[PDB]
Amino acid sequence: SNIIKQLEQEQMKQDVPSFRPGDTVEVKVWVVEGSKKRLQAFEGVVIAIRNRGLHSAFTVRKISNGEGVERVFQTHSPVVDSISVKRRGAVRKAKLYYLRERTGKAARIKERLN
Amino acid sequence: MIGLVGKKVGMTRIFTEDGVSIPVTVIEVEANRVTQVKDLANDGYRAIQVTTGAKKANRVTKPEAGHFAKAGVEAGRGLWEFRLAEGEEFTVGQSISVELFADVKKVDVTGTSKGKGFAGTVKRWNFRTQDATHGNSLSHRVPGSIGQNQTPGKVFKGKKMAGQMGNERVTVQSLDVVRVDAERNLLLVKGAVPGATGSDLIVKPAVKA
Amino acid sequence: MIQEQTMLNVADNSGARRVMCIKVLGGSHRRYAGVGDIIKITIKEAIPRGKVKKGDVLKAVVVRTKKGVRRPDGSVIRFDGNACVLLNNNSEQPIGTRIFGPVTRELRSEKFMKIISLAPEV
Amino acid sequence: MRHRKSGRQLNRNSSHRQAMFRNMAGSLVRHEIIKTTLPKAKELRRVVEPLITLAKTDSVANRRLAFARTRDNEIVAKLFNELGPRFASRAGGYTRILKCGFRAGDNAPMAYIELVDRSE
Amino acid sequence: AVQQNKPTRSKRGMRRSHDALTAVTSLSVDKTSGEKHLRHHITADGYYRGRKVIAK
RNA sequence: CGAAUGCUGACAUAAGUAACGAUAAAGCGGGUGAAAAGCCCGCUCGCCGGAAGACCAAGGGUUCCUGUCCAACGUUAAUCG
RNA sequence: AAUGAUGGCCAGGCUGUCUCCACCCGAGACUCAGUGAAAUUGAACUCGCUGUGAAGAUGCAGUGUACCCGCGGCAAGACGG
RNA sequence: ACCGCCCAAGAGUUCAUAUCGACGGCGGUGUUUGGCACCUCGAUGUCGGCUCAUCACAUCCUGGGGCUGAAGUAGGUCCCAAGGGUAUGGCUGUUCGCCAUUUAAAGUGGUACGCGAGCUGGGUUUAGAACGUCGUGAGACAGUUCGGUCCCUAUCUGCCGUGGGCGCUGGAGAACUGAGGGGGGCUGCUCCUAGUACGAGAGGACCGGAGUGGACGCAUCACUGGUGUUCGGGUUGUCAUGCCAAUGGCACUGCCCGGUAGCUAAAUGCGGAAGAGAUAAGUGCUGAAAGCAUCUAAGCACGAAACUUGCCCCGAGAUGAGUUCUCCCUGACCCUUUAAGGGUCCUGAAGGAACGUUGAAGACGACGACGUUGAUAGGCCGGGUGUGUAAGGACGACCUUCGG
């Protein structure tokens, strides 16, 4: 284990934001459009988190004007440039698989504004 | 440029500057050693016998002690011949550097694969499944028919039969290059070498050119 | 990821809400094809006064499959439901005139450049 | 297929695997010695040794916990009170393994396991 | 699902040829009373690693 | 008397293999013993509870109790029944 | 009309029925101990390939190949039972 | 019977073999419909589907190559060439068949019309009952519809993996050769050189530079998931546990919200090759024989995925026991059917072995690490997977004059 330990001890991200399983999340993932680069939003909640270091995860659940295109990010892949928080969530458990089918008028959860 | 093989440290996904993902093999190779002359002169065919690694003082047995005593060398984990390619040519006893993969652009992997014992035939060869219902008579995984009738009536040699497979030497050649650290003696490669993790697998510059 | 008779929603203004996978294009045995795959399928319904009628048959230019879409870091933007956008026989392009909902940038090559002109998404 | 796993099967049911180690849990505290099958004793170590790491902690939860498995608050009262000072400063090694033959009843490999200090 | 012809006498031995038993012969001799005891096993007097454990 | 898928008696053979009669579960101290997993006492477990509990009828023929024995029987051992 | 563990077809819901299978828990299969079977059986030191023949060869002619003996599996053949 | 071919009416606008052919002629194979009854009636289980195959080549695409009434294109025909590849649905038991739509393309044939000690039974030859018809009936129909029992614990051959034994003329530990064997030989597509060649024009290049398939085989958690009854929290009642606090059980883990590390593919790398030889078809060189001449008879060039190398791997029990490196070591007696001889007194070296703590090695074996010194395994100090806000103390306020 002490082999890659120094290898990738220098490849995990540098300044990741605040979330919970159910905190609102948006991974600005630099994607291919035309001939220039820009940032495009993917704002959502975490339903599923992986505290695994570089190969870990922090989950974003958007709503794509009715049908989303769902994303399993790498927090520590530089393809995730950064995260900018709009609000965190109030969660109990570890994995918010419920965040999906929960929609429209009730789809909300309050802010865990503490 | 002979190949250099290591202990299958483990593996990683190597992260880059512009969104590049490199899940690479992780392997250990110490300063290698060629330990004998093989050629016309003493055998008529040319080869370079090489041991690498170390052994605990008490366990270097006198003749092998003498083998290394006659060698006058530290113990290494095993002596390998590199067949001399008319530019390849060594003699007993040298402790080696790794620069021999300066460019390569592709190397090998050959060694004991993951332990499996009797693997199932469904896995060894990608056979098919029968249906799981509508009267299946206890045949959810059998291989099915194998051969013919009163005509030749014998089983052709080589027929792909289920059984133990893997957990053994496995040549993996013509393999793209990703990265190394000579200063650390790792080998980190897009694509991960066979065998059990921690294994040695023959990594050699490409023989498919 | 559209296979024989795949449940199919429609992203377009043609009226047909109905399509169903029956033949993939581009090479024999082509199994799991989606994203930007074109395949042979048949229409099973339309809107009352649409440009297609019950029974008309055509292929597909996909924009959604329950399998979502991979991206440079191994990351994926994943589809919730299998909703799609058909194609002409000769002129290609979805037989319709107004399309809605997620497509895939993997359909971006100036051949489906027609749609990429004015979409709400991708 | 057993890369990297821990535990055992031992012709025994999990809840009973759970339980069947239970009674010992406080038990061998009570007399400190048995004959036993070494693999079970071996595991009994793994059964007891890991459990013995319990032997270092006294507060409310464990009082339930030591009662929690093996279903008893007897032996728990014992350790709470008595054995604590015994192994004050050892990085483990609280029991010791001694081979003693084969159960005459079944040819099984006999084994005495006892607390490194033992001393009921 | 049966033999079709009755096997010979001589074969039966060879099939029985590897099943021959193996002797221990590796006796260990203790340092206290010298009672022969299996290496790594408490003596019949319950001794191993030299000391009187248990006590029976 | 070699042969009749003859008959009666004895011994092979596959094999030291399958199988060991419900997936409700056991654990430790103490007693005896020539010799404890299976017996006795003790302390723990778990399962049944319109029954795996208590009592009639028919049928059954000493199996009920006490002492005493370990040849065979008990799908293994047996101080036990 | 009502009815049907009745015959035939078409909608809704559903989901490992399938493209295409992955992992996990239980009872056997494997090693040690004890006890301990059946169908079957001219005799056998019991290889492949062409050809010939009460006309589809382990056992014939010519011809290639192959150190002695186990253990876990598989089921083409022995006109297998 | 099929295919093959021999003749030359004739056709074909020309031209009997561009591509067809009268009437007649001579073959080949043994697959269709047939004949004969030599073996099986003290048992050789029938149609079709499913999994797995394999070779022949009278060549489907690809490859080559020639010719062509073959401009590019797309054909027609003849010779070579057998490395690789070779659709998804609806309709009916169906094979057959038909049809819908794709693709380079959906080749033809043998193997007990392959394959039931590997699966099924819908069809076809049992008992029930029906209609039409046929006879006085009993019942028949080779006319049609509904229902209906399938056994094998593998001795030998064989085949896939995996060990013990013995020899290789002293013993021991290393590195070996490479006789010989086995897996791979796809390409589609699209972009540039070239709307250029052709071709009026269209449309359409030759040989060459760029990009993508899809299938397929090797590799690995290293994404992405999944999973994970030992990692957590919330819950229905209750067994009950000196009663408020906590149990454990039980309820399919009681139901439900999650999930390590590993293991894994829908996730991610990888490869088809480059190279040489020989050619082949067939064509190309010179060559007289037959003053010419010619691919032929003597002396000269090419030619496919077809064969010897190039690639991988296996591999000296190759009994032809191949090759080099080590090092262990060189005891006193006799005796005869006196020598490659049997037996009596010292010596056990390399090493090995055994029992012990063990692993990505595993059915066992076998292998690996390691044997106190033992980092071998656990145990004690630093890590932080995954769950997801325990339980318990206290606190005050919360409720009345304040909290507005």
Side-chain angles (χ1 to χ4, degrees), chain A residues 1-9 11 54-55 74 76-79, chain B residues 7 9-17 19-20 26-27 184 186 188:
Chain A
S1 56
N2 277 4
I3 296 88
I4 304 180
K5 63 91 183 173
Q6 214 299 320
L7 297 172
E8 285 190 351
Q9 66 195 40
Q11 270 195 353
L54 178 73
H55 302 312
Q74 303 274 258
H76 312 292
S77 173
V79 174
Chain B
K7 165 267 184 183
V9 174
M11 322 182 152
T12 174
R13 213 156 82 258
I14 310 303
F15 276 110
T16 72
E17 190 275 331
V20 175
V26 179
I27 190 167
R184 204 151 160 121
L186 266 181
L188 306 182

Side-chain angles (χ1 to χ4, degrees), chain E residues 3 7 12 15-16:
Chain E
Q3 76 160 319
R12 171 175 65 212
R15 176 172 67 230
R16 206 175 309 284

